[PDB]
Design a protein around this nucleic acid. Structure first.
Ligand code: MG
Ligand code: MG
Ligand code: MG
Ligand code: MG
Ligand code: MG
Ligand code: MG
Ligand code: MG
Ligand code: MG
Ligand code: MG
Ligand code: MG
Ligand code: MG
Ligand code: MG
Ligand code: MG
Ligand code: MG
Ligand code: MG
Ligand code: MG
Ligand code: MG
Ligand code: MG
Ligand code: MG
Ligand code: MG
Ligand code: MG
Ligand code: MG
Ligand code: MG
Ligand code: MG
Ligand code: MG
Ligand code: MG
Ligand code: MG
Ligand code: MG
Ligand code: MG
Ligand code: MG
Ligand code: MG
Ligand code: MG
Ligand code: MG
Ligand code: MG
Ligand code: MG
Ligand code: MG
Ligand code: MG
Ligand code: MG
Ligand code: MG
Ligand code: MG
Ligand code: MG
Ligand code: MG
Ligand code: MG
Ligand code: MG
Ligand code: MG
Ligand code: MG
Ligand code: MG
Ligand code: MG
Ligand code: MG
Ligand code: MG
Lengths: 129, 122, 80, 154, 205
RNA sequence: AGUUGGUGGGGUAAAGGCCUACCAAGGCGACGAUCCGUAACUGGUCUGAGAGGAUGAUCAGUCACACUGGAACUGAGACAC
RNA sequence: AGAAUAAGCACCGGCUAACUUCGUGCCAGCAGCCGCGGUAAUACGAAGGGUGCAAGCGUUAAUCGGAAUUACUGGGCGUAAAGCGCGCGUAGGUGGUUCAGCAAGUUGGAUGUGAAAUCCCCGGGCUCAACCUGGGAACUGCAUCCAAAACUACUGAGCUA
RNA sequence: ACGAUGUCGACUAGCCGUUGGGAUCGAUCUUAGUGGCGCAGCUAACGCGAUAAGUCGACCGCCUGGGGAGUACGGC
């Protein structure tokens, strides 16, 4: 009953990429907005925009390049049932370094390589390829 | 199983029981032969195998197989038995070592005559 | 710099003593999930000023009785 | 590409009034050794003819895989039916650490250091299916750069 | 220990080079070295992968005359050593003392080289070494005894090995019956027909 | 039911229900108390890609015992191979 | 001085490297699993001939692996074993969104310990190795402090999906 | 005691019926149930397919070869 909304955001994005949609809307959240900013900067999504009037809506437009979608495998790691926390040395490199992992560190929400550049670990939110 | 369910009750391994309950973690054991006789095998096969009832040192009463073409076992002969299950005879789970105490091995065996306790003709 | 320990008062029916529950969350050695464990300690309340429900911080000293080797240094929160 | 490899030969039978009719199925993998590979199946009344039909099928529908200089790109996990497959790149010294259908597929394709394992059922046909469904789907660099420039992605 | 028996029945079984004689006449016109021995000899006998591993492992062991406890110890040491164990095994197995005193040209056969090395007739720096397993460090001047320099068996072995090839990494002075090893051989130096990877595949199972 | 806490005293080299007389009814427990079976513990050993699984032969640290059950004397130290 | 003086065991139908003949004829016998034998047995018992190890070779008993076959890494429940007959609810587990604080979890660092040996890396000695030995690495652990505030927890004040 | 399918929540092409209501101009839209097909996706296959057996979260129950056996003994 809406216990974990970040996985809900990821599931909406994956289900749209599977049904070949161009835009996706969802209820807005600060964590979701941070993750969307990181994903947009990394290049997995085209653009995102946040509405106003008390019930903000986060909207994301998707990319496909070829007939396939750009985000082929997005999944959750630290669900509210495990709460996985990792150190700098033991952070996960995904797909041999061609993917990214979103990590919430004490300096904000960034990617695994950016976290290593600052030598700081945190909580692994989700992995994207 | 959910992680919480496993925390409340962890996964448990089931122990493996021994196929040779007698001779408790022992390579082979001595006994005395109560009775020698012959038996019929299971359905696909047909023969007259030679099995001896043995009373061990501990007290277990077991059956054992006299492997070979001839034997010299009477009722009161001391024998030594080792693990190994005769697949054909129901209930037999041990083998009498040839030429150990009162078996003397089998005579005039040339090919692989170490499993049957025969000496080198040389 | 005394090594204190914070806890919640549970029962005080024995004179000049107080029972304190201290809650910790330990990580399961294999499954990686945190579980809340609790410890019951007995502390010396010289002037029995701690009623039930109060939240206090104790300190380790020499044994005062059998199974009583802690003394409360000061109450940090009261109860309703 | 031309390097044969006969993965399996099996005997099957169908029932008719009077008795049984026998046939032989051959599963084979064919490739060159630098990234082209395909697999084929052939059933015939005789073992040789089955092998040649398998080879002809294998030469058709032969695909291209982008390998990382005698090594895989990244650890990958694939599946087909009830069979699951895991592979990951290895160092230069290591050989092909795999078993059965996987070893045939990998040594024909061109890789040499694979360190692979398989879980679930071990049917050679389904294992070959899973191994291609894994190898075919790798991306290689400057193709994950389908988002932005390179050297800012690795 | 050591192997005693026919030295070409092995070649007939394996069907390959398998140097085991002096090489005076030839390799062929002694034993029709193209058929496996015994009554059942003409059959090619197509053999599975395990056959391949067993056959080449026996090939290498018989050419270098090493037993299997020693061979597996050699393989474990090679696996311990870094950098593509497959050729590390060959490099380390080549540095044996008996095979060096053979390949230096002092012996007609590996067995005769072992004969010489065991009976205390060869030096390393003047010190008596008679273990046919000594791993010769690069730089050592392997030589025969000043007493033994007049034996004619060494002379005949040397003149026979005078035409067998040049390895192009050792520096050998032939007048004084001495050898010298500079650096370990490369993979390309040895005969590039038998692969090393199939052995490490065998021992990885 | 000396069971939990307090007071006075005793006792030990030393804190302490360690012992005693009174005061109150407390204390522990499904986070497994009590009871039954089994077993010296650790560094470590064997396996395993790892996580784990089994285990405590040699060597080293700690503990306990000395035909069975108790008790004290001597001393710096013993309830004494 | 003298080649003098010192080779055995198992196996050969498939899994698993290695075949022919003779003798019995569902008998005698073999066997880890499929299984061989009733009158040409490469599976029984012997011969030759091979294959594998070797001062050893097999057999038995015991542990882990293969076994993703107790699945944290890493399994499942319509029909193969597996959703309580169905609600309500205690402890427990989990918690929509905003602002602010704190610093238990979380992260980085410093300090003390983690006995020696054993494990790992580079050397030294016994003709090498086994074995002995120097230096280093490691011992994921634990405790005490300093700094950060994204997420969880705790505190206060809100908002309406 | 069966949908042989635990409860709760979020997303994912469409077509044809029917039950209890709303709107807009017999038609269109929408809501809570009840049925038949069907694209993706899933499945060993049969088949499921917005009333998932699809993609995801929270919590609970249960399984570990067939017999002996849901039996024997003890407890309630
Ligand atoms: Mg057995
Ligand atoms: Mg299976
Ligand atoms: Mg030896
Ligand atoms: Mg009293
Ligand atoms: Mg007092
Ligand atoms: Mg008192
Ligand atoms: Mg005490
Ligand atoms: Mg208990
Ligand atoms: Mg014990
Ligand atoms: Mg005991
Ligand atoms: Mg123990
Ligand atoms: Mg004891
Ligand atoms: Mg190891
Ligand atoms: Mg494993
Ligand atoms: Mg002892
Ligand atoms: Mg000790
Ligand atoms: Mg004592
Ligand atoms: Mg005593
Ligand atoms: Mg006695
Ligand atoms: Mg006494
Ligand atoms: Mg005294
Ligand atoms: Mg004494
Ligand atoms: Mg074979
Ligand atoms: Mg046999
Ligand atoms: Mg015959
Ligand atoms: Mg035979
Ligand atoms: Mg396991
Ligand atoms: Mg097992
Ligand atoms: Mg799991
Ligand atoms: Mg299963
Ligand atoms: Mg049924
Ligand atoms: Mg139900
Ligand atoms: Mg219930
Ligand atoms: Mg309820
Ligand atoms: Mg509650
Ligand atoms: Mg929240
Ligand atoms: Mg809560
Ligand atoms: Mg820390
Ligand atoms: Mg140490
Ligand atoms: Mg701060
Ligand atoms: Mg049911
Ligand atoms: Mg359900
Ligand atoms: Mg439901
Ligand atoms: Mg449901
Ligand atoms: Mg639903
Ligand atoms: Mg349908
Ligand atoms: Mg199913
Ligand atoms: Mg059972
Ligand atoms: Mg009953
Ligand atoms: Mg009853």
């Amino acid at each position: 009953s809406m216990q974990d909304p970040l996985a809900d955001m990821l599931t909406r994005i994956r289900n749209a990429q599977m049904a070949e949609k161009t835009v996706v809307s969802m209820p807005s959240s600060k964590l979701k907005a941070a993750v969307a900013k990181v994903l947009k900067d990394e290049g997995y999504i085209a653009d995102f925009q946040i509405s106003s009037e008390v019930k903000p809506q986060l909207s994301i437009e998707l990319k496909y390049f070829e007939g396939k979608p750009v985000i082929e495998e997005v999944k959750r790691i630290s669900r509210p049932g495990l709460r996985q926390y990792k150190s700098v040395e033991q952070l996960p490199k995904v797909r041999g370094g061609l993917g990214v992992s979103i990590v919430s560190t004490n300096k904000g929400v960034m990617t695994d390589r950016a976290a290593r550049a600052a030598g700081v670990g945190g909580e692994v939110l989700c992995t994207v390829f | 199983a959910t992680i919480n369910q496993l925390v409340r009750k962890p996964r448990k391994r089931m122990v493996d029981k021994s196929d040779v309950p007698a001779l408790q973690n022992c390579p082979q054991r001595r006994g005395v032969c109560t009775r020698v006789y012959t038996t019929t095998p299971k359905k696909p096969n047909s023969a007259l195998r030679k099995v001896c009832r043995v009373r061990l040192t501990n007290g277990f009463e077991v059956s054992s197989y006299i492997g070979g073409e001839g034997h010299n076992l009477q009722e009161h002969s001391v024998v030594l038995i080792r693990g190994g299950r005769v697949k054909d005879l129901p209930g037999v789970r041990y083998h009498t070592v040839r030429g150990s105490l009162d078996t003397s091995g089998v005579k005039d065996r040339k090919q692989g005559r170490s499993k049957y306790g025969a000496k080198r003709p040389k | 710099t005394v090594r204190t320990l914070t806890g919640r008062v549970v029962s005080d029916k024995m004179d000049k003593t107080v029972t304190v529950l201290i809650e910790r969350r330990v990580k399961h050695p294999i499954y990686g999930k945190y579980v809340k464990r609790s410890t019951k300690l007995h502390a010396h309340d010289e002037s029995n000023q701690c009623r039930i429900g109060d939240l206090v911080t104790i300190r380790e000293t020499r044994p005062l009785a059998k199974t009583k080797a802690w003394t409360l240094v000061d109450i940090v929160e009261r109860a309703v | 590409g031309y390097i044969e490899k006969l993965v399996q030969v099996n005997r099957v039978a169908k029932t008719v009034k009077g008795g049984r009719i026998f046939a032989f199925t051959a599963l084979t993998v064919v490739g060159d050794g630098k990234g082209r590979v395909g697999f084929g199946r052939g059933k015939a009344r005789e073992v040789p003819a089955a092998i040649q039909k398998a080879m002809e099928a294998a030469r058709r529908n032969m695909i291209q895989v982008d390998l990382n200089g005698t090594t895989l790109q990244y650890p990958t996990k694939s599946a087909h039916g009830a069979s699951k497959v895991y592979m990951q790149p290895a160092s230069e010294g290591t050989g092909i650490i795999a078993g059965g259908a996987m070893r045939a597929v990998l040594e024909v394709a061109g890789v040499q250091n694979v360190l692979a394992k398989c879980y679930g059922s071990t049917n050679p046909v389904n294992v070959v299916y899973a191994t291609f469904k894994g190898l075919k789907n790798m991306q290689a660099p400057e193709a994950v750069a389908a988002k932005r420039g390179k050297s800012v992605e690795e | 220990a050591r192997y005693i028996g026919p030295k070409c029945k092995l070649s007939r079984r394996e069907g390959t080079d398998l140097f085991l004689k002096s090489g005076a006449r030839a390799l062929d016109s002694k034993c029709k070295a193209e058929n496996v021995p015994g009554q059942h000899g003409q059959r090619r006998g197509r053999l599975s992968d395990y056959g391949l591993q067993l056959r080449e492992k026996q090939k290498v062991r018989r050419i270098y005359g090493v037993l299997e406890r020693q061979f597996r110890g050699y393989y474990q040491e090679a696996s311990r050593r870094k950098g593509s164990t497959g050729e590390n095994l060959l490099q380390l197995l080549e540095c044996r003392l008996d095979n060096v005193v053979y390949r230096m040209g002092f012996g007609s056969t590996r067995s005769e080289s072992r004969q010489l090395v065991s009976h205390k007739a060869i030096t390393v720096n003047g010190q008596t070494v008679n273990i046919p397993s000594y791993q010769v460090k690069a730089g050592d001047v392997v030589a025969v005894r000043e007493k033994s320099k007049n034996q004619l068996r060494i002379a005949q072995a040397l003149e026979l090995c005078g035409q067998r090839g040049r390895v192009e990494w050792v520096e050998v002075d032939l007048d004084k019956k001495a050898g010298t090893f500079k650096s370990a051989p490369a993979r390309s130096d040895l005969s590039a027909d038998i692969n090393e990877n199939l052995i490490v595949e065998l021992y990885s199972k």
